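User: You have something folded?
Assistant:
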Amino acid sequence: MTNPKVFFDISIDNKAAGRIVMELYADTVPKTAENFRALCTGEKGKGRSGKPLHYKSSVFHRVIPNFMIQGGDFTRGNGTGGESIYGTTFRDESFSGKAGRHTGLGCLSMANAGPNTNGSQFFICTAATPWLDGKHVVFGRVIDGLDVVKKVERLGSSSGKTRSRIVVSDCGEVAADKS
């Protein structure tokens, strides 16, 4: 099965910062890719929370230079929240193959609250993170807009706090067929 492609458009204190395009490894981890894909489009409607199952207007709430960008918390905005399309949380789908190896700058992996607790939160990695191998399910990579990733990364800090709001001002799927 073909790997979906999805996008985020980013704003920093309400200024357009550009586009990040991601490939999702539906070939390796279909359930995890589909969750993330469906959250990019919003097509599943509202969650158990009653908030949209959608990354639109969510924040990158934690950013650490030479490590990662963390987002996907559309219920609490602060790292404690989020929901998958299957409900609150889901099991680790696999650590086989591409799911088991973090690839450095641009690697997409699921954040969690311990083993087998995937939700909606993710890391866009900004450096090598081999210590996450077999802990975070890897489900994609950034294939365009690494410049925008570096732009966001520079606005982080050691603690992870950002001093401007870094927002996914838009998102969606890039459909296979154009018309």
Remarks:
- Helices lie at 30-41, 146-153.
- Residues 4 and 176 are 8 Å apart (CA to CA).
- The chain has one domain: 1-179.
